[PDB]
Nucleic acid binder design. Structure first.
Ligand SMILES: [Mg+2]
Ligand SMILES: [Mg+2]
Ligand SMILES: [Mg+2]
Ligand SMILES: [Mg+2]
Lengths: 176, 37, 126, 134, 133, 188, 23
RNA sequence: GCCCCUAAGCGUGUGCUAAGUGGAAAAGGAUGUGCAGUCGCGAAGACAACCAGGAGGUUGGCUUAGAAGCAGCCACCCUU
RNA sequence: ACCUCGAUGUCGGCUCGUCGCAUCCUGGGGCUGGAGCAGGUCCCAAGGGUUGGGCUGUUCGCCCAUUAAAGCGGCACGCG
């Protein structure tokens, strides 16, 4: 509600095409599509911005308004700037490397693990223990980051594992 | 993950949400994770 | 704000005026949040700075013999008052006007004699 | 545990529980009282448990009034005997409580604390009840 | 940053300041000498050091004023305070001694004049279970 | 000491049946017997009556507009309900426009005794006599610095001008006693 | 147990007026 | 009783139901939802969000190898 | 004591199985006063397995070797 009632500032170099409930956006980073909820109506204001409107104030519409608004906001923001999640590793003997387009991690396992970069996403590395994923779909980027994080079991006694950029995990202490 | 018919917040910054079909409480302290059942 | 806040702020400013050697009023409307650091952070230690609404300064200024400042409350009011020596605070407020060119000066009060923008400058330099 | 010092009749006929409490409805001594809503017997064991819980939750101060005293006896037949014999001996004492009657009252000054104590007490009773203020 | 009430004539007390500041990485050898050379002048008044941590692990102990709570002990003559406030007394203190301790504590208390400087110690004595006469 | 206005319509049918029928729609019956006068069965709004009560109730005075006929009455009892809290039936008596009346009034303690002491209000009501409008809605008793066992009776309460106490002056209204210890609490 | 529970609960139906034989 | 079996209405006006509750059940737990009755605040800019602060006496004594604001009781204060 | 005394043969052991998980293991997950092995607690999970002997009719129980296991119950305290 408080968010859905606000407009969506569309940048200059963006082409927004509304087709009923469906919507598509084209920008420098790529092209994305989306489908808005049926009880909500999307409209392109005279200033190019996008606005979602609800005909009633029921719980369904009140919950879907801000959801769809933030969805279209992230959609239009990705094509222009894209999302990038940086991650770092901690623990002696842990290493990560970029092989072609996939990633290879060695985190103490008897064998190394491989993660194949799916479509619409890319990986990069700045240090043997510091890498970063990039993409357009925030959902896909977050899913890939969560997978790379849960790769290893969460070890609080020593923090050995994967961590996000500004991650702050709890740490216990072993007296012996 | 305590599983009892009754659940209440033991932490200080806890929210009680309603999941798919069960209630839950959320706080950083993993010892306070409770589910109704 | 709440009525409890309105009632506690007036008492706070009364305590400020009764425990401080002097107080200078300025206009702080026009600054963002990021300024408040280079603001209070380095001033609240030795000096002190407070801000409130106009409706509270009228009730707070009716305690001491500063009735002459009734007509000097035009616009928002932000009060500054030192805990020790006032010459440093006076010099700071005087140089801030020429550094920012946005803090309008109106005057102050000394020994019950209200000073204007020209009278306060005769003592700010000494 | 409370118990009558002496009774005129050793055995009774299960005093009926019905109607609405005629007397002892409004709090008189304390400031915050517990008023029941379901008619059912209350045992001296439950009364003592609630009293101990209240005394433990309220330390170094406060006072508690108990407007109910267990005086109605209730027998318990032999362990595994057959049906038909002299009525068993009284085995536990209860007090017929009707809805609307206050059972316990508190004088602890801090509201929140008195309410929490009354909650911990009612949680020890076998019937539903609520809190009332003077 | 932390301020403890460590005795003046004593040197290297482990319980109070053993792991308090030593764990932060500040040495104690030169600290003992710097404390003794400054406390040998008085030899009769406790001095609380305001431990100020630094980035380069340096240390410049702040020679603050003595503590009012402990100076109340010397004013009353007994080292162990009372057990209950406004219920028991230990001894009587003189207004001249109160003004003297206030003057010595001028550089620590938030007071402005001798009146408030002594009234703060009077309130401390009230909270501890002692009154000024 | 300002009368509170309220409307009321003469009831056309009495009995438990009519009473329940009126209560179902948010109304309350009442009687206006008065002083040796012909009683009148009236019906008032439950919400308005409850509002007036929670505002200045507990024997408050009232003004009845019975078909345009003004009357000044005073309440004698409520008897809301054993379980619930609703005005099931009220009773009113005409005040004769200034006649001296005796009625119960609620007392309240406002103060703070010594730290190691607890206060107990043994009686909440006091029999006070006064005019129709001068009837005080509440009485206040203060406590400060008193020691244990300082029994404050009804006679020690300060009453406004024109007010009188009908109950004997020996009624112990407030009793302060040393803070009961854990042993005193567990030996009850 | 369940058999008797169901036999007693099926009496609550609004088609028999809340009465049935053998409880 | 009126959708099929199963003869009769997939009858009409206003509301509730997301759980197949309808088509078993308790103590207790619970930011589910609709109505009405109250109270705090709120364009004098309400709450969340954001940002700066969050001391001196003092480590209040008692208690303690030990309470410093945060195992325990007492009161629960003055300055800025 | 509601059918059953003009008959429903009662406990163990052998053969034979069937079904539930309030799960002994195998499988997965949460919290641990989980440094690791080895443990404690909870949730889901019955596809599979759940030994051979001495005492005593025995059920049960103790003991000897092991075993990831030597599980709890219903089926007329299963099966004449
Ligand atoms: Mg036959
Ligand atoms: Mg299971
Ligand atoms: Mg299978
Ligand atoms: Mg054998």
């Amino acid at each position: 509600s408080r968010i859905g009632k606000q407009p969506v500032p569309v940048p200059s170099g963006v082409d927004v095409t509304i087709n009923g409930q469906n919507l598509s956006v084209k920008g420098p980073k790529g092209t994305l599509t989306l489908d808005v909820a049926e009880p909500i109506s999307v409209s392109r204001a005279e200033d190019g911005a996008i606005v979602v409107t609800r005909p009633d104030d029921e719980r369904r519409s009140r919950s879907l308004h801000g959801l769809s608004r933030t969805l279209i906001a992230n959609l239009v923001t990705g094509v222009t700037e894209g999302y990038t999640q940086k991650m770092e590793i901690f623990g002696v003997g842990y290493r990560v490397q970029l092989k072609g387009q996939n990633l290879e991690f060695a985190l103490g396992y008897s064998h190394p693990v491989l993660i194949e970069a799916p479509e619409g996403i890319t990986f990069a590395v700045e240090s043997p223990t510091k890498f970063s994923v990039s993409g357009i779909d925030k959902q896909k980027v977050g899913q890939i980051s969560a997978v790379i994080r849960r790769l290893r079991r969460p070890d609080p006694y020593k923090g050995k594992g994967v961590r996000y950029e500004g991650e702050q995990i709890r740490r216990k202490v072993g007296k012996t | 993950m305590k599983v009892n018919p009754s659940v209440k917040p033991i932490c200080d910054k806890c929210r009680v949400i309603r999941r798919h079909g069960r209630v839950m409480v959320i706080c950083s302290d993993p010892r306070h994770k409770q589910r109704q059942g | 704000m709440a009525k409890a806040d309105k009632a506690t702020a007036v008492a706070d400013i009364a305590e400020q005026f009764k425990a401080s050697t002097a107080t200078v009023v300025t206009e702080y409307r026009g600054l963002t949040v990021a300024n408040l650091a280079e603001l209070r952070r380095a001033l609240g230690d030795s000096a002190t700075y407070t801000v409130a609404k106009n409706t509270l300064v009228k009730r707070a200024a009716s305690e001491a013999g500063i009735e002459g400042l009734d007509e000097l409350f035009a616009g928002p009011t932000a009060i500054a008052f030192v805990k020790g020596e006032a010459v440093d605070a006076a010099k700071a407020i005087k140089k801030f006007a020429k550094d920012n060119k946005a803090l309008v000066i109106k005057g102050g009060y000394m020994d019950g004699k209200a000073l204007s923008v020209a009278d306060v400058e005769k003592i700010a330099d000494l | 545990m409370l118990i009558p010092r002496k009774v005129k009749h050793r055995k009774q006929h299960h005093p009926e529980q019905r109607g609405i409490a005629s007397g002892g409805t409004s709090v008189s001594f304390g400031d915050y009282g517990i008023q029941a809503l379901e008619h059912a017997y209350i045992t001296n064991r439950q009364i003592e448990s609630a009293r101990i819980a209240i005394n433990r939750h309220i330390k170094r101060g406060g006072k508690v009034w108990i407007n109910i005293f267990p005086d109605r006896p209730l027998t318990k037949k032999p362990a595994e005997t057959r049906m038909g014999s002299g009525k068993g001996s009284p085995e536990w004492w209860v007090a017929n409580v009707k809805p609307g009657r206050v059972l316990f009252e508190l004088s602890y000054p801090d509201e929140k604390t008195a309410r929490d104590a009354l909650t911990r007490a009612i949680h020890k009773l076998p019937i539903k009840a609520r809190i009332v203020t003077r | 940053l932390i301020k403890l009430q460590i005795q003046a004539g004593q040197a290297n007390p482990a319980p109070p300041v053993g792991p308090a500041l030593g764990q932060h990485g500040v040495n104690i050898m030169e600290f003992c000498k710097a404390y003794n050379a400054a406390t040998e002048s008085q030899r009769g008044n406790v001095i609380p050091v305001e431990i100020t941590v630094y980035e380069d692990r340096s240390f410049t102990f702040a020679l603050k004023t003595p503590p009012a709570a402990k100076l109340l002990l010397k004013a009353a003559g007994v080292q162990k305070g009372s057990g209950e406030p406004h219920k028991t007394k230990v001894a009587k203190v003189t207004w001249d001694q109160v003004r003297e301790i206030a003057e010595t504590k001028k550089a620590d208390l938030n007071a402005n004049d001798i009146d408030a400087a002594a009234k703060i110690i009077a309130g401390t004595a009230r909270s501890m279970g002692i009154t000024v006469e | 000491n300002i009368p509170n206005k309220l409307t009321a319509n003469v009831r056309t049918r009495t009995g438990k049946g009519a009473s329940r029928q009126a209560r179902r729609d948010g109304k309350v019956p009442a009687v206006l017997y008065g002083h040796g006068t012909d009683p009148q069965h009236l019906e008032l709004n439950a919400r308005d009556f409850a509002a007036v009560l929670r505002s200045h109730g507990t024997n408050a005075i009232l003004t009845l507009d019975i078909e345009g006929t003004e009357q000044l009455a005073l309440t004698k009892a409520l008897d809301v309900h054993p379980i619930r809290r609703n005005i099931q039936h009220a009773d009113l008596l005409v005040v004769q426009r200034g006649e001296k009346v005796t009625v119960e009034v609620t007392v309240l303690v406002e103060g703070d005794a010594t730290p190691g002491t607890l206060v107990t209000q043994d009686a909440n009501t006091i029999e006070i006599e006064a005019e129709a409008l001068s009837i005080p809605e509440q009485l206040t008793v203060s406590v400060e610095g008193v020691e244990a066992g300082t029994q404050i009776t009804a006679g020690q309460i300060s009453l406004p001008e024109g007010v009188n106490l009908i109950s004997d002056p020996e009624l112990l209204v407030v009793n302060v006693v040393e803070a009961p210890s854990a042993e005193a609490l567990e030996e009850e | 147990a369940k058999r008797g529970r169901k036999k007693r609960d099926r009496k609550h139906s609004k088609a028999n007026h809340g009465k049935r034989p053998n409880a």
